[PDB]
Amino acid sequence: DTSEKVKVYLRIRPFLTSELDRQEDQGCVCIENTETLVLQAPKDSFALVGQATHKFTFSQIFGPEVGQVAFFNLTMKEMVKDVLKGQNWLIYTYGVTNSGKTYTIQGTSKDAGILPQSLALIFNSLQGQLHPTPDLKPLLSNEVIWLDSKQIRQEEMKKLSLLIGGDTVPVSVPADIRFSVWISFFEIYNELLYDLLEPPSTLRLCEDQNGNPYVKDLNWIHVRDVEEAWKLLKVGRKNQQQSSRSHSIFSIRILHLQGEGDIVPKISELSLCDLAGCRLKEAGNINTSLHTLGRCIAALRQNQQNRSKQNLIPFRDSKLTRVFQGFFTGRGRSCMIVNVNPCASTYDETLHAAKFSALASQLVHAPPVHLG
Amino acid sequence: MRECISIHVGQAGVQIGNACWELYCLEHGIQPDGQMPSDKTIGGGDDSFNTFFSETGAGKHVPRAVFVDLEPTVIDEVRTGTYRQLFHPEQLITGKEDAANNYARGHYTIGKEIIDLVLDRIRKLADQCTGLQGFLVFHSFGGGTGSGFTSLLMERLSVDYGKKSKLEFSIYPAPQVSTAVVEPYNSILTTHTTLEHSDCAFMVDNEAIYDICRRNLDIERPTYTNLNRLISQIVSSITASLRFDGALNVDLTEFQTNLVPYPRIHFPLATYAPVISAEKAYHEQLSVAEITNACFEPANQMVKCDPRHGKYMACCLLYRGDVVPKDVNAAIATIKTKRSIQFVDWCPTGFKVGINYQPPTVVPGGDLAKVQRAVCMLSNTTAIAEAWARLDHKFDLMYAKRAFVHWYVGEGMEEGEFSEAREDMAALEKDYEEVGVDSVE
Amino acid sequence: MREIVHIQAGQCGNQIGAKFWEVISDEHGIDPTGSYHGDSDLQLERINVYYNEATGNKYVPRAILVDLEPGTMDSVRSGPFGQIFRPDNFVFGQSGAGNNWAKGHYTEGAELVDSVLDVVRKESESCDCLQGFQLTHSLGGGTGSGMGTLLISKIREEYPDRIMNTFSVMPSPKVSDTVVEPYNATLSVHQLVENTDETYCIDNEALYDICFRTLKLTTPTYGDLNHLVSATMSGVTTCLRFPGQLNADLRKLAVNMVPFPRLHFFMPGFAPLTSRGSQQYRALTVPELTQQMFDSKNMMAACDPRHGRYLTVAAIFRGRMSMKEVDEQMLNVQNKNSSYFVEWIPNNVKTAVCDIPPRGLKMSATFIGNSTAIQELFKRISEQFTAMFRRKAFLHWYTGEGMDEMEFTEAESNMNDLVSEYQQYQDAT
Ligand SMILES: CC(=O)O[C@H]1C(=O)[C@@]2(C)[C@H]([C@H](OC(=O)c3ccccc3)[C@]3(O)C[C@H](OC(=O)[C@H](O)[C@@H](NC(=O)c4ccccc4)c4ccccc4)C(C)=C1C3(C)C)[C@]1(OC(C)=O)CO[C@@H]1C[C@@H]2O
Ligand SMILES: Nc1nc2c(ncn2[C@@H]2O[C@H](COP(=O)(O)OP(=O)(O)OP(=O)(O)O)[C@@H](O)[C@H]2O)c(=O)[nH]1
Ligand SMILES: Nc1nc2c(ncn2[C@@H]2O[C@H](COP(=O)(O)OP(=O)(O)O)[C@@H](O)[C@H]2O)c(=O)[nH]1
Ligand SMILES: [Mg+2]
């Protein structure tokens, strides 16, 4: 690619009335432009670095004026197209308390986040060009399982059990490809993978034929339309501001299955990984994973065409980077969604989050500091 | 009344405590049993001084000290050694697991659930004083408890009491000799503690004391039992004025006032002149002038630095034994005459003098000759900047490649904190370079 | 308190365990009957590290015998120290793997692993504060590789905080009496890289070399090799049990030795070692021990360290000594041989000192190395592995056990990546 690195995108959460009631507004978050976020310290005269201004590069920045759907329509819809066009894409998400990441990605049903809108766009696009029933499972990005009658019925029973126990992209091929769209949802917690679509009541890793790691015995669920996917995802969410304590990975695989029943058609994968931002143990593990992840991303940014050196990407040091080895390697590509908040109480965490997750981070200092 | 609570943290702390309390018991004639035969012999006086010993009804004198290790191997020696019956049973061992040369474990994870006991015991000790206070905390940089738990304890003490002098006696890493490979991380991570909380920190370096022992004491193969004795001699000399009569007694407040020009420059060096072996005790007069000159010799300093590379911002001399003001004034005039000793232009006086009539004692089985007089010099200088610079370089040589970082990150220490610590150190260095500058008219 | 749960699997593991328990019971003065008849009180100060207290003033080691198949049970139970072990820990099956990793991992081992896990859980529940587990086994064999890795994985899943320490015997490159060493060794290394805190690579070739050249033995046998390995393994954990001027433990060594999570393969060594007839000619000084440690011919890993760079080393000395002499000698080693140490570590040496020597010696000391030269042994195995795998020499003995061929390829790739990782740090940078 053209040194794409990550192409990070930023959301800035608006203030809430209860937050303004407590004078949380002290100008923590602002923008020099849509590309460079500016983070400044609040005037923390309390408790008896006047600005400490930091700048963070992003592919695009979206202020409080930009809603969830406004965010999706500007950045991620293309990536959805890019997946169904024939690519494989992975959207990381990061943020801290009050950042709005759990509302940016999931959100409500009306001001839908990136995840429900990805569901909406993809499933509405492929109506009239999908297989009515399950016929072919996307186990791997380069392998599938053809399902006999009993297997198809069993998968339908799985989908119905998960549903019962508590708009367009350039792709348009009716009567040529009976698309088979399947979804999955799990989480990495304490370096253990837990399948989450299994309704409320540990997964393993192994490589494919080309050495790409994948997760074993993942409860892939065939889906017909938007609402089935959203309901399955919502039920799976219960097994996982309110923020995660684990790295929750949702994924969708579309089989471009021609009418002849082509085995191993083009498998198009879109995945989203919501990342957790001194409960001690998990916290250390979270930090450990994030640390490894940062190194990997740094390597992935250091090993672009800007250096033309590969060095080592330490993706083997964690489950999170190992399962996403294919995207560090080149079998897929990845981008980032960062969330922040202008509240004073969040500032330090927010700042750290940007320093972890921005496309690039620099110190401005705000030289007007050193007043005294 | 005048009392000081001795806190010791970590193995270096505990061993220094053993040597120190041996020296104190010898000075006050207190047996290992805590009984004091001189009480019935004299029948009066406060020779069981309250500065280091609390007296109970039975005539037993209990030390005023508490100390922790998070490793029962070291404190169990005290619990079984000759002084097991001296110390109170409250020697807080809690080391079901050690910190293992890890600042994060000492500060964030393992140190929790022990700091409460230590603070409770220190509160109980502090409630027994009707008078002056000041804590003497002993530890070692580069270790576990000495680096993390010490920071936690200082942070809690500065809130619970606040306006109490907290003297720090810390083992610093040597330029070359080191017993660990993660030493620079744990050393740098304590700069925030040593800046914001400590009121005066005395650094010593093991390589310098090895040089002194090999050269002056004529000990080919020294071990920790001698370095601890020398450090104990230093600490006894500092607190001599609180116990024994003297022509000029300097308290801790007047001690800190004349030695710390600014809030952020509280890092004096220390040295002790009459090191002198037993055989060399003859053939030398050891007059006041000789020891005063010997204190300024760079080869006799306890930190591997060179005062000639910097300027002397303050100096305090504490004399013991047969010392008369006439000779002290003559020696100080001679020192001011010499051009090898450079004083900053903004400190015209430069000297604080304290004289005590109690001559030093000699530990049985020791290696220091009995002398009539002795002197301990403390000096706030800019050359100490060197002792930081080397360490900072070592830190960088690791942190550029994130070596050993994950061992901390898994313990709840945010990575960015590392950078913050180094920044504080950087600021400190600049401050010293900004006080060695001659005034401009 | 800091207790250790000792586990051992396979013939090699059980024999090393027998020699090790003999040495430890000698160190603490414990009779074969389990009673104590020593002299110094320090023996009972920290006897809880290895032994539980049984009611009759008796001491029982925390040893768990994994697949002590009757051929080895008859040896251990009827040996000199057969009666020291509590019979409930003699866990074993019948019809062992027979030099087949798949049988040791999937087919036969999965049937027996439950009993061993139950015994381990019962033993661990009795500890006041467990420090870590200590495993002894051999790669390239049968049950020792398969079940060894299975137990490592499951125990580490059960007890993630605690230190998983492994003492494993590698397959020698040349002196081998088993055809299918490469497959079992490769799969075992693939399982070992991700599931242990520190692994000590021992090779029979190096031990034979030490016995022939240093001790001047003419007819060495497996007893002597176990003697050397037991001496090392006692030396490693000496600081947990006895006081010293500078203390250390397993976690302290792990912190000061593993610069990155995957670089935890070590080269053990021990000193002094010399034949009886020459012992009168050489005096024991810290210079002599330091000279003998870093001599390339004393290493037990069968790899010359000079082909690469030391990531980091550690010396654990035992006996009364001066700290200045130790520090001077280690600094001299770093300065003189600076070409063989990594530049971007200011100080590559960890030091620990215990003041209780072995029973019959004034002074002793144990070396642990960590150098990129170790990559060599992996390369050799990989070469032999591919030399079979491309021809499918013996895959039907494995694929018949419900093992897909893919499990081989992954393991091979993993080993290569490990080698590549070490090769990153051989170059000056
Ligand atoms: C009598 C005499 O002159 O020989 C000594 C001896 O010191 C020598 C020859 C010993 C002796 O060792 C050997 O000959 C040997 C042969 C094969 C493999 C290993 C050793 C000795 O066996 C070993 C034994 O060492 C001990 O007692 C240590 O405590 C040792 N004990 C055991 O290994 C042990 C063996 C059987 C039963 C119980 C304990 C030890 C070492 C490290 C950690 C713990 C314990 C000693 C003093 C001797 C003999 C007996 C000949 C040496 O061994 C050790 C490990 O110290 C070989 O060179 C070293 C040091 C000496 O040169
Ligand atoms: N001068 C002097 N230094 C000592 C003494 N004992 C230990 N040290 C120093 O302590 C430093 C490392 O501290 P540690 O051995 O880790 O002991 P610690 O500081 O309590 O940390 P822990 O390992 O958790 O106990 C080394 O650099 C030693 O030189 C001593 O008796 N005298
Ligand atoms: N050091 C040592 N190695 C041994 C001993 N006995 C066997 N071995 C090695 O162990 C390997 C055989 O492994 P084995 O114990 O049979 O595996 P198992 O079948 O699962 O028990 C061979 O390569 C031998 O070199 C011993 O007493 N000492
Ligand atoms: Mg310790």
Residue numbers in the entry:
A (entry chain K): 59 to 106, 113 to 230, 286 to 320, 327 to 365, 374 to 410, 414, 422 to 515
B (entry chain A): 1 to 441
C (entry chain B): 1 to 429
From the reporting publication:
KIF20A is a critical kinesin for cell division and a promising anti-cancer drug target. Among these, the Kin-6 KIF20A (MKLP2, Rabkinesin-6) plays critical roles during the metaphase/anaphase transition and cytokinesis. Among the kinesin classes, Kin-6 motor domains are unique in having long N- and C-terminal extensions as well as a particular long sequence inserted within loop L6. We also provide, for the first time, a detailed description of unique sequence differences and their consequences for the structure and function of this atypical kinesin by solving high resolution structures of the nucleotide-free (NF) state of KIF20A, bound and unbound to a microtubule, using cryo-electron microscopy (cryo-EM) and X-ray diffraction, respectively.
To assess how microtubule binding influences this KIF20A NF conformation, we also determined the NF structure of the full-length MD, (1–565) by cryo-EM, while bound to a microtubule. Three-dimensional (3D) classification of the cryo-EM data resulted in two distinct classes (1 and 2) of KIF20A decorating microtubules, with one class (class-1) containing the majority of the particles (66%). Overall resolutions of 3.1 and 3.2 Å were obtained respectively for classes 1 and 2, with 3.4 and 4.0 Å respectively for the kinesin part. The two classes differ mainly in the orientation of the MD relative to the microtubule so that the minus subdomain in class-2 is positioned further away from the microtubule. Also, the switch loops (L9 and L11) are well resolved in class-1 but not in class-2. Given the further separation from the microtubule interface and the lack of ordering of the switch loops usually associated with microtubule binding in other kinesins, class-2 likely represents a partially unbound intermediate. In both classes the MD is in an open conformation. Note that relative to class-1, the class-2 KIF20A MD is rotated and the areas of the minus subdomain that make contacts with the microtubule in class-1 are further away from the microtubule surface in class-2. For the lower resolution class-2, the map was postprocessed in Relion, applying a bfactor of −80 Å2 and low pass filtered at 4 Å.
